[PDB]
Amino acid sequence: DEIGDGTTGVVVLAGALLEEAEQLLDRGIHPIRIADGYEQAARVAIEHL
Amino acid sequence: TPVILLKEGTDSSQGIPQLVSNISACQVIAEAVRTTLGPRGMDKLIVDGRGKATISNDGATILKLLDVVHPAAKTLVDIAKSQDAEVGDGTTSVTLLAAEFLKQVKPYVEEGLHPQIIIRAFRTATQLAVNKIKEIAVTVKKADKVEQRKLLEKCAMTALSSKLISQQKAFFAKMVVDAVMMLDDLLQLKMIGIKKVQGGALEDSQLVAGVAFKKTFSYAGFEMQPKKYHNPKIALLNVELELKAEKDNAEIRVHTVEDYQAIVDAEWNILYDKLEKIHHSGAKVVLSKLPIGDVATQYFADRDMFCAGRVPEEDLKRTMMACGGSIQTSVNALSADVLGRCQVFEETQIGGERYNFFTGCPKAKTCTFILRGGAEQFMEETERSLHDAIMIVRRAIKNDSVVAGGGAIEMELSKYLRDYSRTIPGKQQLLIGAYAKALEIIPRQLCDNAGFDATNILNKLRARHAQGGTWYGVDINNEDIADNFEAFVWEPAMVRINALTAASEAACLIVSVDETIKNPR
Amino acid sequence: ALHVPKAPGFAQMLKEGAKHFSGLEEAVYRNIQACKELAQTTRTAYGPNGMNKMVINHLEKLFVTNDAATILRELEVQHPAAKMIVMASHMQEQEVGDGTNFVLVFAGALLELAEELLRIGLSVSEVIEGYEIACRKAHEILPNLVCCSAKNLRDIDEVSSLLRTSIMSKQYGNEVFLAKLIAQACVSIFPDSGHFNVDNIRVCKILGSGISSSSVLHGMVFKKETEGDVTSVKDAKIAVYSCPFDGMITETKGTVLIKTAEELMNFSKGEENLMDAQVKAIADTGANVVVTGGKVADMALHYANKYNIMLVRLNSKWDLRRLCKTVGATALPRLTPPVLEEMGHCDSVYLSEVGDTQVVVFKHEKEDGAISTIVLRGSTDNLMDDIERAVDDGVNTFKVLTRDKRLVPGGGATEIELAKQITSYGETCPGLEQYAIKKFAEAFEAIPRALAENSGVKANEVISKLYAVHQEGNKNVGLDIEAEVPAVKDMLEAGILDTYLGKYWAIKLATNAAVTVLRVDQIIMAKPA
Amino acid sequence: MREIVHIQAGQCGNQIGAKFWEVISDEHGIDPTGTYHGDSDLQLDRISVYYNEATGGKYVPRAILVDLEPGTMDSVRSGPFGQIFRPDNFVFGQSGAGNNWAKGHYTEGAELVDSVLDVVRKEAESCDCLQGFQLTHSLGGGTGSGMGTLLISKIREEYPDRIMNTFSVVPSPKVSDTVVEPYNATLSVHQLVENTDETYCIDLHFFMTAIQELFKRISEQFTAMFRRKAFLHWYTGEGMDEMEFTEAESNMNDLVSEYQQYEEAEEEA
Numbered sequence A: 001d002e003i004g005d006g007t008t009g010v011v012v013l014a015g016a017l018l019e020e021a022e023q024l025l026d027r028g029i030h031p032i033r034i035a036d037g038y039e040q041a042a043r044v045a046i047e048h049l
Numbered sequence B: 001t002p003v004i005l006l007k008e009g010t011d012s013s014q015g016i017p018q019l020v021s022n023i024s025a026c027q028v029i030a031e032a033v034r035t036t037l038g039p040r041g042m043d044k045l046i047v048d049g050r051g052k053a054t055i056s057n058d059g060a061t062i063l064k065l066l067d068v069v070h071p072a073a074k075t076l077v078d079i080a081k082s083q084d085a086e087v088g089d090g091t092t093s094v095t096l097l098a099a100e101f102l103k104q105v106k107p108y109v110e111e112g113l114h115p116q117i118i119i120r121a122f123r124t125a126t127q128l129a130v131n132k133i134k135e136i137a138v139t140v141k142k143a144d145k146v147e148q149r150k151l152l153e154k155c156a157m158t159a160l161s162s163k164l165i166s167q168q169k170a171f172f173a174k175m176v177v178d179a180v181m182m183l184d185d186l187l188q189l190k191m192i193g194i195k196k197v198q199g200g201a202l203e204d205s206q207l208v209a210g211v212a213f214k215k216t217f218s219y220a221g222f223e224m225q226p227k228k229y230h231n232p233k234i235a236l237l238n239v240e241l242e243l244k245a246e247k248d249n250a251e252i253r254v255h256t257v258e259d260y261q262a263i264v265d266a267e268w269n270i271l272y273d274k275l276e277k278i279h280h281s282g283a284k285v286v287l288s289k290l291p292i293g294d295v296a297t298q299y300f301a302d303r304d305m306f307c308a309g310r311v312p313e314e315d316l317k318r319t320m321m322a323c324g325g326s327i328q329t330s331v332n333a334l335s336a337d338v339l340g341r342c343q344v345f346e347e348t349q350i351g352g353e354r355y356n357f358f359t360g361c362p363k364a365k366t367c368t369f370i371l372r373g374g375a376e377q378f379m380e381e382t383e384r385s386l387h388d389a390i391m392i393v394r395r396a397i398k399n400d401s402v403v404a405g406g407g408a409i410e411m412e413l414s415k416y417l418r419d420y421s422r423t424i425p426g427k428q429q430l431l432i433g434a435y436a437k438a439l440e441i442i443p444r445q446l447c448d449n450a451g452f453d454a455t456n457i458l459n460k461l462r463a464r465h466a467q468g469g470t471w472y473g474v475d476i477n478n479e480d481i482a483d484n485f486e487a488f489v490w491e492p493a494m495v496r497i498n499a500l501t502a503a504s505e506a507a508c509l510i511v512s513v514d515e516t517i518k519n520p521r
Numbered sequence C: 001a002l003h004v005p006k007a008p009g010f011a012q013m014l015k016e017g018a019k020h021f022s023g024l025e026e027a028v029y030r031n032i033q034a035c036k037e038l039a040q041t042t043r044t045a046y047g048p049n050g051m052n053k054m055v056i057n058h059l060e061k062l063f064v065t066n067d068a069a070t071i072l073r074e075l076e077v078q079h080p081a082a083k084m085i086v087m088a089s090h091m092q093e094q095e096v097g098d099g100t101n102f103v104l105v106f107a108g109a110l111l112e113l114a115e116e117l118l119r120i121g122l123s124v125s126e127v128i129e130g131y132e133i134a135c136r137k138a139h140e141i142l143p144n145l146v147c148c149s150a151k152n153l154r155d156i157d158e159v160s161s162l163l164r165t166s167i168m169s170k171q172y173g174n175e176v177f178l179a180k181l182i183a184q185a186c187v188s189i190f191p192d193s194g195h196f197n198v199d200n201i202r203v204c205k206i207l208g209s210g211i212s213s214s215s216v217l218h219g220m221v222f223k224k225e226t227e228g229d230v231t232s233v234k235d236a237k238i239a240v241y242s243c244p245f246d247g248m249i250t251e252t253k254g255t256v257l258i259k260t261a262e263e264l265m266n267f268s269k270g271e272e273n274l275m276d277a278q279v280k281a282i283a284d285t286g287a288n289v290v291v292t293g294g295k296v297a298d299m300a301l302h303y304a305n306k307y308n309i310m311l312v313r314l315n316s317k318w319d320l321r322r323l324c325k326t327v328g329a330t331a332l333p334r335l336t337p338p339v340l341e342e343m344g345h346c347d348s349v350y351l352s353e354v355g356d357t358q359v360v361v362f363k364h365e366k367e368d369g370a371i372s373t374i375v376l377r378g379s380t381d382n383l384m385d386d387i388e389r390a391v392d393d394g395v396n397t398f399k400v401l402t403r404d405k406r407l408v409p410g411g412g413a414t415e416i417e418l419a420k421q422i423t424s425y426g427e428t429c430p431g432l433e434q435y436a437i438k439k440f441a442e443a444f445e446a447i448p449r450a451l452a453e454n455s456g457v458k459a460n461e462v463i464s465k466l467y468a469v470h471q472e473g474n475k476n477v478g479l480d481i482e483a484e485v486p487a488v489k490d491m492l493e494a495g496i497l498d499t500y501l502g503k504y505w506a507i508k509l510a511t512n513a514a515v516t517v518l519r520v521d522q523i524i525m526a527k528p529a
Numbered sequence D: 001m002r003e004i005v006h007i008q009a010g011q012c013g014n015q016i017g018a019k020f021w022e023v024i025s026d027e028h029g030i031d032p033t034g035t036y037h038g039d040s041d042l043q044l045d046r047i048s049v050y051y052n053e054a055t056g057g058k059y060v061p062r063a064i065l066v067d068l069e070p071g072t073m074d075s076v077r078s079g080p081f082g083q084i085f086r087p088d089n090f091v092f093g094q095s096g097a098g099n100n101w102a103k104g105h106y107t108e109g110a111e112l113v114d115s116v117l118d119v120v121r122k123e124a125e126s127c128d129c130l131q132g133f134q135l136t137h138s139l140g141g142g143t144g145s146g147m148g149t150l151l152i153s154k155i156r157e158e159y160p161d162r163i164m165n166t167f168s169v170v171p172s173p174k175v176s177d178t179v180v181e182p183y184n185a186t187l188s189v190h191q192l193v194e195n196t197d198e199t200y201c202i203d204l205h206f207f208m209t210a211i212q213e214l215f216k217r218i219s220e221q222f223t224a225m226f227r228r229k230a231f232l233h234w235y236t237g238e239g240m241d242e243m244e245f246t247e248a249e250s251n252m253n254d255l256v257s258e259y260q261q262y263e264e265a266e267e268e269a
């Protein structure tokens, strides 16, 4: 409803974004630390786009 | 025996086992909301019997969503609603404090101590702790406009740091402060337009300086009239501008066909008389609670005039204190002083929805929040998080007194009570001393939620306070202690005063109960 | 094996499910057992050191209260003999208001002590006659023990120390603050004629900060908003109406009849212009605030806002009548302007928010009003109800002091002194009744026993010490509470006094309920349904 | 504003009346304890037509419950929404009519009815102005029909200028649940002809064909029963007579005539 294109591309990226965090949790990493580092990366990719 | 006193099924218990089993029942309520405290807290997920999920980090709504039936535990759920009605913040800090006042006095109950001695001791400590906060509460002289804006930004930023929107706490804290100075004296909570629109990003939320409401039902011809005006004149009405019967209780008895045709022309002349009176007044935008028929829609399309109908009552009242008109139930008096005015009016598209905007009001005394998220539960958690900074700033104007946080004020109180207990003799030492050891539950939970060493840190805080650093709290980014007053972690003094009185009253009530009786059905 | 058949006669003609208990070993000795169990349930809540009780009725509603009458009201009882003891306690609540636990303790000790007399040979008629003789003797000794009557019921420094005993018996610890609220409210509405009314004190509960934040307010308060736009008037003229604020319609089924086109155009304008004159007629009398009790009309609301008038709606009937006494107005059954005597003058009417609750306040600056309200604030819905009852005990004490100003020393100094004088009287009566009068005197020791057991001290030493001091002549010596050891203390100096009328009706109703149970011989119960 | 009251009689009348109060208490948001916790203004403008308010906010109904058997009173008391009724409005007997219309009309209905008029007075005293009565009874059982017929006759006499509506029930079309059902029905309809303003039947002012079928089948069984004079001594022995039953069938035939639907010797004239 916001754009109209890319609705099967978001669920693939979100699903692959959660899988990559599975290994970080098993090493003793707080989930809030992961959710904090993710937002910093999304500010680098958008400013690069 | 053959004739029995009470009904068959009246369960009854009493004694020492009755009271100890109540202390162990409040340990379950406090543990349901234990891990939602601090900047590193985690929210919960509850499901109803139908299948609707409610995802939240605040104590008040978590305890409302559990079907607690234990009579002793139902006191802890009732004090949470009291805290979110008086101050609106600190809800989950009175639940751990209420359970810690009962765990620390559990062994003394088993030894045979008269519970009246405990109640006298609890009331003596609360009055000595509430008075200590007011003695060391920091205030300022001549709070000027600049310094009175920084003070509320810091307080609103702290109430937001433990919520879902924690990365964008700087952006949001600037909108909440600006949204409360538009109000004048009573600071009504119904003058803020929380609206929720699906789609977008969390940084796309906007605050408007007027009113904004969704597009309502429209008839044929609605797309034939302009949707952008420069200086309109809002006509706030309460009338049905549609072709109908004059009165439900009416009857017409005509005799000749010449009078038949004049009746049909009389209904078309009544309606056209109302529309002409509106058009002569110079109005350009008209609104009405009652419906607007299609004949009136095509009347306003041929004269470049906007029309709307079936507006909710909560939205017309928000327009009035933003434009400056008045609701008219009759069109017989439309003067220049009963019309509204603004600077821009348009109808844009946001997230596949049509919204009307009324920005540009220099004398506006109301605002409206448009929230942009990505799911139904993303907006509800953002609205509940915004509802905490609203009430914190509202309470912070009537009381310009602040204290440091992050355990900095729990530890100064526990130091003052330990010194007081060593002077008075008797059994009051083991009761006041048990009150001081229960106030350090707040710093302990902050180091347990982040994953720290809760014992080594507390040994350092207890040494910095006994030397004489009054505002020395904890730090989660530095793995250490620091000065929380210079670190700009501030909170009003009214969130801790009401937290001790509510926690002390709930603990003193449970102790006094001797026996319980449950009746059948 | 063989089976024992049914005895011929009445036992063979009974309906199924019914029961028959006849005799002395099957009806009298079992009735005392049921009533002795009732006394052990409510005894724990006696005195300052009483304990609360968690009672849940069949609507899953929870009660945390310390009143004796409230506990019995929320407990179902299926024993007929225990039901008279309940109805004996509910009668003292409506006459006096305080002393519901005294009936249960006294009627529990008179009945139990009568069981021992029935095994040593004494008949039932000898016990009943012995108790009544003792009951009359106590009603003659009682007036001679009155000390420290009330001096002035309009002084705020004297009345506050007289209600403290009633409050301290229910909210220990908060008895100093709570006594200053009731005393501040009862003397304000006390008329010159002296006819005190209990319904003129109102209690409103707003979930808030704490007990110490409660305050009194000369006027009325409502849990409602304002219908119009005006929300503050400085000096208002209230015009109360009982009829709804709209056009007048006939009760018979009436309809309009339009036969010409010209009458159809003027009908809508006729009704509106008619309403403008009616609203403007009231506005010319200075009536800033109009209070209705019916349905407000959309057209009538428009003209109310035009002339800066305040419109408040109260759909509670009796709540409307209470406002007429506060402001001094009269309810108008018709929509006509009041003339001179139907305009109530207030001092401030405004809409304010108290603890997230938008309320309307009819504040008065004068202390001489008709109705005064008490705003109660607390943290739990249960804590406010418990304090609601404690306020009602203080108000009911003020009413009794209006009728009878005589007071007696409390704290057990009255029952022990009544035990010495009755015991000596029975020694001078030779016959079979002297055993019953002595047992009547020993029932007065159950009250000091209940105060000593609840405090945490050995009871037998307390009655031992009280009897020695009273023999010397000190009739104003009771039981100490603050002392850890079982000591004694003077009560007139300390200030613990009870009402003479409170105890006079307690003994009369307790003995009446105890002598009726003994008179019953046969019990014929029907099938429960 | 023209407040109305209700009267419930018999075993059948109590059961339906107990559930009738259910649709009003919940629609107006009246709590089972008698308090009010509604959140609308349309539930309070007409709250006084059916409920009488008490001090402190208690709203009690305006119903009177009468019966000749005490065993049917405690069912409503202990059931849902049974605590809100006025304790003084319960009127019960000890004998019972036992499907006897005449026993519940003159020989034993003449004592308890005097205990009902004194109750309807104290309720009618509190109301501002009343416009009518609502009564519920049956037509097959003599316990309710005989007591109701007398009760409905002693209400009109004291209030000759007040309307009164009934919600009576009617017997089954083909099957019959009592031997003397036709006897108990004919004697009760003719007493509702000139004593009622609107009646309803639940299975010229009769509502629910054109009711013509109901009255046709009743008089067919009644005529067959009266021809043999069967079970007639149960009614005549307590104070009736033969002519009383004749007026029941003669009047019953008149109402059928008002409800209109729309031999081998024919030679000369």
Ligand SMILES: Nc1ncnc2c1ncn2[C@@H]1O[C@H](COP(=O)(O)OP(=O)(O)O)[C@@H](O)[C@H]1O
Pocket: B036, B037, B038, B039, B041, B058, B059, B089, B090, B091, B092, B093, B158, B159, B161, B162, B405, B406, B407, B446, B474, B475, B476, B489
């Ligand atoms: N910057 C910070 N550093 C350390 N602790 C903090 C900081 N900001 C807030 N806190 C602590 O986090 C707690 C917030 O708890 P919160 O989840 O908001 O409870 P509630 O919702 O009941 O108010 C406060 O008690 C405060 O002491």
Ligand SMILES: Nc1ncnc2c1ncn2[C@@H]1O[C@H](COP(=O)(O)OP(=O)(O)O)[C@@H](O)[C@H]1O
Pocket: C045, C046, C047, C048, C068, C098, C099, C100, C101, C102, C165, C168, C169, C170, C410, C411, C412, C451, C479, C481, C496, C498
């Ligand atoms: N400070 C006190 N010291 C000793 N006795 C007290 C004190 N306050 C009240 N009492 C006694 O407690 C008794 C019982 O009071 P309470 O249980 O509250 O009501 P009730 O009179 O219905 O039993 C009173 O008769 C009074 O004499």
Ligand SMILES: [Mg+2]
Pocket: B089, B090, B091, B159, B162, B388
């Ligand atoms: Mg918070």
Ligand SMILES: [Mg+2]
Pocket: C098, C099, C166, C169, C393
């Ligand atoms: Mg008392």
